[PDB]
Design an enzyme around this catalytic site. Sequence first.
Site, mmCIF file in Angstrom:
data_model
loop_
_atom_site.group_PDB
_atom_site.id
_atom_site.type_symbol
_atom_site.label_atom_id
_atom_site.label_comp_id
_atom_site.label_asym_id
_atom_site.label_seq_id
_atom_site.Cartn_x
_atom_site.Cartn_y
_atom_site.Cartn_z
ATOM 1 N N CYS A 99 0.825 -1.202 0.000
ATOM 2 C CA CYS A 99 0.000 0.000 0.000
ATOM 3 C C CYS A 99 0.861 1.255 0.000
ATOM 4 O O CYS A 99 1.736 1.413 0.847
ATOM 5 C CB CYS A 99 -0.935 0.007 1.210
ATOM 6 S SG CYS A 99 -2.041 1.431 1.282
ATOM 7 N N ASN B 276 -4.037 8.072 -1.960
ATOM 8 C CA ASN B 276 -3.834 7.173 -0.832
ATOM 9 C C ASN B 276 -4.661 7.668 0.342
ATOM 10 O O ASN B 276 -4.666 8.866 0.639
ATOM 11 C CB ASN B 276 -2.363 7.085 -0.433
ATOM 12 C CG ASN B 276 -2.129 6.088 0.684
ATOM 13 O OD1 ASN B 276 -1.502 6.404 1.695
ATOM 14 N ND2 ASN B 276 -2.641 4.877 0.510
ATOM 15 N N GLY B 277 -5.350 6.744 1.013
ATOM 16 C CA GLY B 277 -6.243 7.085 2.098
ATOM 17 C C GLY B 277 -7.688 6.796 1.736
ATOM 18 O O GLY B 277 -7.979 5.871 0.968
ATOM 19 N N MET C 99 -24.177 5.957 32.825
ATOM 20 C CA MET C 99 -24.583 4.569 32.645
ATOM 21 C C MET C 99 -25.139 4.408 31.238
ATOM 22 O O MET C 99 -25.457 5.389 30.564
ATOM 23 C CB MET C 99 -25.618 4.141 33.691
ATOM 24 C CG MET C 99 -25.771 2.642 33.837
ATOM 25 S SD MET C 99 -24.176 1.810 33.884
ATOM 26 C CE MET C 99 -23.634 2.201 35.542
ATOM 27 N N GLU D 40 -8.773 0.046 30.175
ATOM 28 C CA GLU D 40 -7.769 1.095 30.127
ATOM 29 C C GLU D 40 -7.400 1.535 31.541
ATOM 30 O O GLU D 40 -7.950 1.058 32.537
ATOM 31 C CB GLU D 40 -8.276 2.272 29.303
ATOM 32 C CG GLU D 40 -9.431 3.010 29.942
ATOM 33 C CD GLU D 40 -9.943 4.141 29.080
ATOM 34 O OE1 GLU D 40 -9.572 4.193 27.889
ATOM 35 O OE2 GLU D 40 -10.714 4.979 29.592
ATOM 36 N N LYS E 250 -20.139 5.360 24.006
ATOM 37 C CA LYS E 250 -19.697 6.565 23.305
ATOM 38 C C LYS E 250 -18.813 6.156 22.133
ATOM 39 O O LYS E 250 -17.579 6.130 22.251
ATOM 40 C CB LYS E 250 -18.956 7.512 24.244
ATOM 41 C CG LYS E 250 -18.037 6.814 25.228
ATOM 42 C CD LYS E 250 -17.322 7.814 26.111
ATOM 43 C CE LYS E 250 -16.576 7.118 27.231
ATOM 44 N NZ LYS E 250 -16.387 8.018 28.400
HETATM 45 C C1 LIG Z 1 -18.280 1.947 34.644
HETATM 46 C C2 LIG Z 1 -17.875 1.383 33.317
HETATM 47 C C3 LIG Z 1 -16.594 1.610 32.838
HETATM 48 C C4 LIG Z 1 -16.217 1.091 31.609
HETATM 49 N N1 LIG Z 1 -14.945 1.318 31.135
HETATM 50 C C5 LIG Z 1 -14.570 0.802 29.918
HETATM 51 C C6 LIG Z 1 -13.293 1.025 29.434
HETATM 52 O O1 LIG Z 1 -12.495 1.682 30.094
HETATM 53 N N2 LIG Z 1 -12.918 0.508 28.216
HETATM 54 C C7 LIG Z 1 -13.815 -0.230 27.478
HETATM 55 O O2 LIG Z 1 -13.482 -0.691 26.390
HETATM 56 N N3 LIG Z 1 -15.088 -0.455 27.954
HETATM 57 C C8 LIG Z 1 -15.468 0.062 29.171
HETATM 58 N N4 LIG Z 1 -16.734 -0.171 29.647
HETATM 59 C C9 LIG Z 1 -17.694 -0.965 28.819
HETATM 60 C C10 LIG Z 1 -17.517 -2.451 29.063
HETATM 61 O O3 LIG Z 1 -16.229 -2.834 28.650
HETATM 62 C C11 LIG Z 1 -18.555 -3.216 28.263
HETATM 63 O O4 LIG Z 1 -18.488 -2.812 26.917
HETATM 64 C C12 LIG Z 1 -19.941 -2.916 28.800
HETATM 65 O O5 LIG Z 1 -19.898 -2.938 30.206
HETATM 66 C C13 LIG Z 1 -20.959 -3.937 28.325
HETATM 67 O O6 LIG Z 1 -22.234 -3.500 28.725
HETATM 68 P P1 LIG Z 1 -23.212 -4.526 29.469
HETATM 69 O O7 LIG Z 1 -22.711 -4.686 30.880
HETATM 70 O O8 LIG Z 1 -24.620 -3.987 29.482
HETATM 71 O O9 LIG Z 1 -23.169 -5.858 28.767
HETATM 72 C C14 LIG Z 1 -17.116 0.347 30.862
HETATM 73 C C15 LIG Z 1 -18.397 0.122 31.342
HETATM 74 C C16 LIG Z 1 -18.776 0.640 32.570
HETATM 75 C C17 LIG Z 1 -20.161 0.394 33.086
HETATM 76 S S1 F3S Z 2 -24.380 2.362 42.631
HETATM 77 FE FE1 F3S Z 2 -24.261 1.844 40.470
HETATM 78 S S2 F3S Z 2 -25.163 3.438 39.104
HETATM 79 FE FE2 F3S Z 2 -23.005 3.992 39.437
HETATM 80 S S3 F3S Z 2 -22.632 5.373 41.188
HETATM 81 FE FE3 F3S Z 2 -22.445 3.212 41.926
HETATM 82 S S4 F3S Z 2 -22.013 1.987 40.026
#
Ligand SMILES: Cc1cc2nc3c(=O)[nH]c(=O)nc-3n(C[C@H](O)[C@H](O)[C@H](O)COP(=O)(O)O)c2cc1C
Ligand code: F3S
Lengths: 117, 1472, 116, 158
Positions: free
Chosen positions: B1, B231-232, B479, B886, B937
């Site tokens: 590439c 390229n790209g 959440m 992470e 996200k």
């Molecule tokens: C509090 C919290 C922190 C998370 N931190 C990460 C993260 O740092 N890196 C990542 O890839 N996913 C992160 N996740 C997402 C989880 O890896 C996973 O994708 C997700 O919990 C799946 O959702 P479920 O529990 O409804 O099946 C995080 C999820 C939660 C709730």
């Molecule tokens: S109680 Fe559960 S909704 Fe979040 S602030 Fe604590 S992990």
Amino acid sequence: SLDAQEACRCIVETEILAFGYYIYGWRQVPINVDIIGEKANATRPEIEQIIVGNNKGVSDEQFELDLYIIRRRIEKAVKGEQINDFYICSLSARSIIYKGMFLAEQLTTFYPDLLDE
Amino acid sequence: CGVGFIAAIDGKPRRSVVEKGIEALKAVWHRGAVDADGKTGDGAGIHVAVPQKFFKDHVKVIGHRAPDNKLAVGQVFLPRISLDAQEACRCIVETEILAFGYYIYGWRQVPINVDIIGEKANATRPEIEQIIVGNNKGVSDEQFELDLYIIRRRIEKAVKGEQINDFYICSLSARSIIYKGMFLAEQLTTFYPDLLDERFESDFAIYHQRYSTNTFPTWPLAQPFRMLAHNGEINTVKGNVNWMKAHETRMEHPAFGTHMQDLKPVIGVGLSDSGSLDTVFEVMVRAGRTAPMVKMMLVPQALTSSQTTPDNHKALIQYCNSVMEPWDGPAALAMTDGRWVVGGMDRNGLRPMRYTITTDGLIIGGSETGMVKIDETQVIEKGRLGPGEMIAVDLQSGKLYRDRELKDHLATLKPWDKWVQNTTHLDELVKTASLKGEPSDMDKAELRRRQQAFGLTMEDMELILHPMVEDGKEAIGSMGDDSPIAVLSDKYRGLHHFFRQNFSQVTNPPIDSLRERRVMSLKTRLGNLGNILDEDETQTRLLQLESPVLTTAEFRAMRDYMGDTAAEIDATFPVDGGPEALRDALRRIRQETEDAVRGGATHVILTDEAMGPARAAIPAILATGAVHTHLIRSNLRTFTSLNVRTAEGLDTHYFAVLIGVGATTVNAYLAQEAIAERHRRGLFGSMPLEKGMANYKKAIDDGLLKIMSKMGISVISSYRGGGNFEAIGLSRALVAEHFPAMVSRISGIGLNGIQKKVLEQHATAYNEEVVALPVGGFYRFRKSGDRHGWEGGVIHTLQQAVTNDSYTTFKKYSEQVNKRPPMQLRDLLELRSTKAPVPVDEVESITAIRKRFITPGMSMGALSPEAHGTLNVAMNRIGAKSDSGEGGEDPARFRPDKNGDNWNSAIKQVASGRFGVTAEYLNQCRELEIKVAQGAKPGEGGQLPGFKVTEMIARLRHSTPGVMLISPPPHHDIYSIEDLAQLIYDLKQINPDAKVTVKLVSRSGIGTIAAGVAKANADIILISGNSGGTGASPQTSIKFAGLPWEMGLSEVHQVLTLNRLRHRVRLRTDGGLKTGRDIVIAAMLGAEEFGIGTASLIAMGCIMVRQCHSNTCPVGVCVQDDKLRQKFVGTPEKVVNLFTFLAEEVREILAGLGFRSLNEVIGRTDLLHQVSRGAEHLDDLDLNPRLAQVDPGENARYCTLQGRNEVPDTLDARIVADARPLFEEGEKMQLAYNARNTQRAIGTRLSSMVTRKFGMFGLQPGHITIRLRGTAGQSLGAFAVQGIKLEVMGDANDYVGKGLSGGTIVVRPTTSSPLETNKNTIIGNTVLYGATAGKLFAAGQAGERFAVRNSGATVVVEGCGSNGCEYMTGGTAVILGRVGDNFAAGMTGGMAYVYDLDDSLPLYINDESVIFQRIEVGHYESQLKHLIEEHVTETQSRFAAEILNDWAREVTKFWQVVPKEMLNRLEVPVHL
Amino acid sequence: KNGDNWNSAIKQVASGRFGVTAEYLNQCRELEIKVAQGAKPGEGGQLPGFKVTEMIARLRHSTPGVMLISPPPHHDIYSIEDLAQLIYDLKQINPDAKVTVKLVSRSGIGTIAAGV
Amino acid sequence: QRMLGFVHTAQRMPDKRPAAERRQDFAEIYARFSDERANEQANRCSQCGVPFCQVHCPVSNNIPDWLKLTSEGRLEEAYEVSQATNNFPEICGRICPQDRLCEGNCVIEQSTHGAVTIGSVEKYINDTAWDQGWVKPRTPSRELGLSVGVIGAGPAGL
Ligand SMILES: Cc1cc2nc3c(=O)[nH]c(=O)nc-3n(C[C@H](O)[C@H](O)[C@H](O)COP(=O)(O)O)c2cc1C
Ligand code: F3S
Ligand code: SF4
Ligand code: SF4
């Protein structure tokens, strides 16, 4: 490609619903690809069926005429977008066609639907 | 590439050019995708000048007479199967060429050699032929080229008329020729022996090789094209094509003439992005302009508001930006007009481009600086190309224009400065507007009645509107989204809830909008579209707004400026119209708009202020979509604008979808009325109303920038009217008819459902005496709001069943979950087998099933140490893998405890920040993982509040205690798929035992990305969903981004099966898994392993408080405080019982079905049926697109290989075979080899052996040293530990010192090179990405993004580029030269010193987070002195020697840059 | 401790056997028999009486301040059969090393080389 | 203020009279909150998603909403929100056993942080509204021509 299929489906559905008929849905015909050769398998198309019902209460002959007009319009529209490997083996309320590029004796093997009662 | 170009400066043809081009093509085989066959390639091409003597001798031999002028040669691909289509194509070509009068000499068959092509690339091989057309009319050269182009277009149209497939014209010109195909790069001269001739000589040559994401090659898609090589990949093609469809209807030029009629549909069908861009490039060049002007008009530069550029270039860029819409996206271009030869870069400068001038007047440019072998005493100047830069060669005059000279030469043709003055702004209009005409605000009752008609609750004003007006930034949630999807809902969900946003996986990088905000513009222009083939002052006469969103006063000013050219259109339908009133209203408005545009109206104001008790309001999105599509289809959109006055606009996702559908300016008056009403009650406190409106508008603009940057688009003008969304739940006909280009893979509601919902809400609002708004539940559970996945009884029952360990209570929980009405896609599927049930005890053991569940990664920043450790110890006890996420990990946890507990984690993640990635962090795992995008996200970076960063996390991430840590959206390492292959190679080199996992997010178009990443030797794929949890992220990204995993998983499975690739990689899904039925359904769809996540957190005590970001979770799961962490109640046995119950449920279900193992049910989609909710809901959802079964063939339906997919072996092996005394005896060594650019990651395996033997800091510095001579590869010395010293003589390509871990690298020019060390590029882009310790001394200039995310490294470089020292966190960096724009952006820790001789730093620096001063303390002077002395000692430079000689007078030339946050934490204050 | 190993991978069996012990032959990889030197063929190495410090006297098991002249012959190699015997001895005492013979260029060396 | 103050405050019910004095009279034993104490005790709420304070209240008031509208002044809107879903709020706040219905299942009560005093704030916000005439009868606009009969004058009847 998995994107040309979606274009063909949306074209068929936007051309059938232009008359007012009710679309019940699509169905995938069960097949058995272990009996076809290699050269006839590299160009095998995706076989599907669409179930269109009549809700306007029109007679049979008018319904057949509408289906033929819809088929012609779909063919022209899909030719407009220059999409290859697309065909309508039949579209009617009377008859159906099961055809392919297999051997003669292996017809009921590729299409198990005909083995029904 | 890669792309590349070679040019003779003076402009004299010679064979050396073609020879060097072929030699350069022979050395790009390390970046392509290797195949086990050995013959299958994926594209290659070269583009040279026509060898007149060759064809003239051929004509002489045939029997004709050699003509006087130049010849014309065309190369065509004809069909090969049928021998009759060839004759039709030939007769068409001959009847179209002879229509102009040119003399046809005849056809020739190109000699080929078909023994080298594979099998799949040979079944579709076309018949290659050439036609020799001579010029007998004696016309000039340019007229001849124009005739040939017209003839080519006419032939294409004529052959498209007869519907003949497999026909292509690779070139038809009298100047150039193209040899391209679907072979390997090195086998180009083997398939085409013509190039092995002695008469093929040229003065320029371009070459290209590509990297495909699928394994079905087609020959007409191989670059280079005709006057372009790319390229790209271009992000905005769905929007640029829609604008070309409106530009065509007004373009014309006297050069073409009547034949213009045959060039109206300029962009045909069946092309890629780089094909459409090439087509428009050619049609713009052939009309008079020159290649630099077209490159500036198509891909312009970032129009910066800085005094570092003369005003002439600013005026030129203003003109270019006004006349045409930019074509954004990562792009390295090497194009060639008939006369010029240009090499250019895009706006952000992502892909690399490096060139070289020899003393033979020869310039060589390409993606790698070691392709063509050149004796090291023949170079005059080495260099690079920044963002927006370019370099051109004039062949006809024989001159070389660099960037600045070319800009100064191009700013001379036309008086741009005199032309730009025609534009008028809007701030002047709103200032000269008299302080009169202020209307009276609506009544509280009227406002409540108009709010209730659209479904605005009181929680959309207390939660998501108060923060906007108060601060200027959007809300933040903590959440995932567990609310039902739009169509399966039962409340009134607005039409803007059916459109999911888009983003970019590995194929394209996102754009950071917090730091790189200088290259993002929100300009809007009314009265802009016109003839795009003209150059006059009437082209730049329009009205310019600085933001697409308008306030009411600004809207009135704009309306009064418009005056009698605007036409208002109603957008209301009568409530008493009937069963088809909405369709009639749509018809009516889309006819009135067209009838008004033909009548001279040049502005369309689509308002809905007529909504009353007898007229309902059409959904604004539907109205604007219908109107814009109708105007585009009728060739009238080029005449007017499109202004919308909405009454439902309150959130940022509304404006996004309205501008994406095609609206020009958006006005939201009801939100302003509500803000004013809330203000007069005195809720905001003591701030004026204008400040509140300004804050609201700023928040909306920032949210628009965020939504725009998720895809990689930095301009709004090319984003408008493109359809960068995906509809889920809208019928196929409706979307295909009213919206330009969107995919609805499952049909949904038509128009009747929309009409019914609208009428019901309108009647409820206008016939009931309203006194207040409903509290509403969309972000928080309420008894009156919608249903949620996690209610109270469910949580309590699950916690009881997990604590008391009673399987019956768990079955109670599962039944309660599986009894609610349908809420997700997997609720309409139903299992149906045909065998007879088997006894339960016959199915596999619980252990063999529990070893298939894993827990996803959750960072230590979000969670607490106790919860993280508890999950890790609980998952290592049953035998399954856990995950660390992470944020790094604690090393003291690397050994089992005294009680037997193992606190480690078997899956380590490599995030976008590289916050804990060391050389030891990677040698302590069994499976690595690359996180491309998260579920909640997508296309963004994780965040962390300023108070969540305690001392422990600060030490663990090597950062500053108490500063907000926000991750970069892009990867800075992954800008395409070849970079992903390189990163996977690096990771497989550093850890010889682990597997590499790539994590994606469900969306449309994931099949091709999955087929591409499966070819990069990745062996585990993870498909997240849209309902995954998160620690902290905005609300709009939580609720309005992503797609359910039922789509992504079932697409990836089928696409992988179709390419005969499923038998190599595993599939893993997660997001919304709660019971065993869900797991069995996911296994049927194609997955093999499963992730649980949130449910696990509930088993440890979490009760869905949704305040994780506020650092006050009561139970103590996501808390960093101490008094709250003392409330933890978790216990590993809880998680173990959870997993045991979850596996026993799956065993029960599989026994009831009739199988005895999960392997028997994976992929068997035909065991699933779709049932309807009933005959009273009337949704036409058809899930058949995911129930289609692709028959596998010979291989099984799952992974059937043990161990990871192996990779080729680099130089490191030899080193390990030579320095054996170091590993057995424990002694010093010294090695010397020859480095070549085809050797990647030199010194990584040795680092692995040293880390496993002694550790990171077990050896003294310089214990083992290696000396290389020549151009090193990429990622040179990645993850090197202390005790290793590399010394390169020559240069390095890219990623040099990535992830350093204590090593030492030294790069210097060879001793016999006559080059100024401080004026030549020596290393490339992304240097020291995420280093933690070590040193790097270079004796040249670096590339872009120099020392990003540096944490502990120390580097002394003699120059830099743009965006350098970005987001650095620790270490010292000395730069003895100039820097680029946006320097030290987002820096939050460390120090920098710049040696500024020209005193031009206060113009380039990003002076918001760092302060720059002069050195006034001796302790910081001795530091610089010692650093430069070490530099001189290592690299033996001459510039630094001179600086050290004259120290007393040069010390007053250094600027010291220090972050603001470290101003009160350092030991010695920088002041006195 | 810098890993700089001061050992030598080749040990010589001189005509005087001044330091040849059992450990001196098991601390090498590759041995060497010295029959004649390039500068003084058919002669033994010399060492003046004042060059012999106490360290060298202890290292060679000799008397400090005494001239040390090696014997021209070997007293172990009187014909090719004795050379084969000595090579067998050296290959038995060290089971991992090789045996190198050092000659001096002259006419008739071809037959001697074919014999060794 | 941003109402998450259960971390740095302690729960305390309103004023009470000692036992040696309670035994004589027949009046109540508690007292109405003061303004600065009610605005503090209504601030310990956490605005938690999935509010258990509402799932377990038999009439299911919108508890977090008027707990918020009380912690920011704005007492009249809080009275509206509280009254729009309960006919006898003060009587309930006085007699309803809260340790088993609402105060016994608060999220911060399950974590040993004490429980947000809900019923006492109900009393406060519903009695301070009575003194300033914010309470008015719901006279029907258009008198419909029908008649309905009930038996009993208890809570259900009224
Ligand atoms: C509090 C919290 C922190 C998370 N931190 C990460 C993260 O740092 N890196 C990542 O890839 N996913 C992160 N996740 C997402 C989880 O890896 C996973 O994708 C997700 O919990 C799946 O959702 P479920 O529990 O409804 O099946 C995080 C999820 C939660 C709730
Ligand atoms: S109680 Fe559960 S909704 Fe979040 S602030 Fe604590 S992990
Ligand atoms: S008392 Fe507890 S559960 Fe009820 S609203 Fe307040 S924080 Fe939520
Ligand atoms: S005290 Fe009030 S809020 Fe609590 S349960 Fe009784 S009526 Fe409901």
